[PDB]
Design a protein around this ligand. Structure first.
Ligand SMILES: CC(=O)SCCNC(=O)CCNC(=O)[C@H](O)C(C)(C)COP(=O)(O)OP(=O)(O)OC[C@H]1O[C@@H](n2cnc3c(N)ncnc32)[C@H](O)[C@@H]1OP(=O)(O)O
Ligand SMILES: NC(=O)C1=CN([C@@H]2O[C@H](COP(=O)(O)OP(=O)(O)OC[C@H]3O[C@@H](n4cnc5c(N)ncnc54)[C@H](OP(=O)(O)O)[C@@H]3O)[C@@H](O)[C@H]2O)C=CC1
Length: 339
């Protein structure tokens, strides 16, 4: 049955009103600098090793899938300080799940007074509208996440009926320790990523991540947007290329965010995406790309490689990273309510 029939979505969503010194409204792009400061204040408590970047907020507000008039709320105190924000955002196409991202936060100094509950209550009402409006016969997931230490976020989500449904491990690899050498199958070469590989790599990724939990295919616009972020490092990203005519059979995309080095305790490159096409797996291509990237990171003087992995990876990514010397740093949790 359709989500528009399974979900009883409100005809009208009420912006919050609670907080005697608070004024609430939808956010606009003009709020981005104050939101940056909010996210940084909150992240110092909730996720100090990961920094929200200004250009991420800019791309989010510029995304055609995001209507800030209907998909965002912001709370301002009596001195005009921004103290909370929430959004509820859905993409335009869905493959196996209708994913609604419920992103928001409350300033650490204004927690424990019901402001988070107000934000999540609003996010869920708008989220139900996103689900019904999708008119899809797929699971509907209203979703957020938290680092395991952020019990204040986790407990708010559990209190509201969201469940911990998936676990993520951040892993690090010391680039000063020996990096193994791995050979490629015949007919395969490694190239540095660049614009000419964008579409072949998007195609490879969308196939490979059919086997990753939750993932939906990446539309071209969103793919290209993520590559405009200052953190993306095309020259530390690599593809393995075979002949079918060339095709990308494995790929590894990297970020470098030097503003995160201090809190993480080392300089590091971040493995953002790593995939191998189904028919080319079990041939060491992931190892070949990871080791190639680790040598590239080391040559630039970076101390570590860092990445995230589904703790229950169905294609064995955990064993892959463990065998290459990655070790646990931190854990995070997907918090989801299903319709
Ligand atoms: C940073 C991120 O993006 S995290 C998400 C990781 N990417 C994905 O999940 C995408 C979907 N999966 C894939 O693309 C592929 O299956 C990958 C990337 C996990 C691995 O692809 P491959 O090229 O076949 O990896 P590779 O051949 O180099 O290494 C295989 C290793 O996996 C490990 N492994 C353990 N159990 C399994 C399993 N059940 N199935 C597969 N691999 C397993 C082993 O350590 C194995 O090494 P071995 O040679 O000693 O046996
Ligand atoms: N990712 C997301 O989408 C969102 C994330 N968050 C995050 O969740 C975490 C919690 O936010 P926070 O503002 O503290 O949540 P709340 O203050 O709303 O709730 C947290 C605790 O405070 C108490 N409380 C609840 N309602 C009231 C109220 N009306 N008046 C007084 N006390 C109340 C309750 O504890 P008790 O039973 O003891 O009274 C509750 O368990 C933060 O880290 C925040 O950033 C919040 C919203 C959205």
């Amino acid at each position: 049955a359709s989500l528009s029939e399974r979900v009883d979505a409100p005809d009208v969503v009420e912006i919050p009103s609670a907080g005697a010194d608070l004024t609430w409204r939808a956010a606009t792009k003009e709020d981005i600098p104050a939101l940056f400061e909010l996210w940084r204040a909150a992240g110092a408590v909730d996720h100090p090793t990961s920094l929200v970047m200004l250009d991420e907020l800019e791309e989010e507000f510029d995304d055609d899938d995001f209507d800030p008039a209907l998909d965002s709320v912001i709370a301002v105190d009596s001195l005009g300080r921004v103290v909370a924000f929430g959004s509820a955002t859905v993409k335009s196409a869905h493959e196996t799940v209708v994913w609604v991202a419920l992103d928001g936060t409350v300033h650490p100094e204004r927690r424990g007074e019901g402001i988070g509950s107000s934000v999540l209550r609003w996010q869920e009402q708008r989220g139900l509208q996103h689900l019904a409006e999708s008119d899809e016969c797929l699971p509907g997931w209203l979703a957020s996440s938290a680092e395991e230490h952020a019990v204040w976020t986790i407990e708010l989500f559990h209190r509201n009926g969201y469940e911990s449904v998936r676990w993520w491990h951040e892993l690090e690899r010391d680039l000063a320790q020996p990096i193994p050498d791995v050979t490629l199958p015949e007919g395969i070469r490694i190239e540095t990523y660049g614009p000419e590989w964008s579409e072949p790599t998007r195609d490879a990724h969308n196939e490979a991540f059919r086997d990753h939990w939750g993932s939906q295919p990446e539309a071209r616009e969103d793919w290209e947007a993520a590559h405009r972020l200052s953190a993306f490092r095309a020259d530390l990203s690599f593809v393995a290329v075979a002949r079918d005519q060339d095709i990308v059979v494995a790929y590894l995309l990297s970020d470098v965010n030097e503003e995160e080095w201090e809190a993480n305790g080392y300089s590091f490159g971040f493995v953002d995406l790593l995939g191998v096409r189904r028919d080319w797996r079990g041939r060491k291509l992931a190892q070949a790309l990871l080791t190639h990237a680790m040598r590239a990171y080391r040559h630039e003087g970076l101390q570590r490689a860092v990445l995230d992995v589904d703790a229950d990876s169905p294609t064995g990514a955990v064993a892959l990273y463990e065998g290459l010397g990655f070790s646990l740093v931190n854990r995070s949790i997907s918090l989801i309510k299903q319709f």
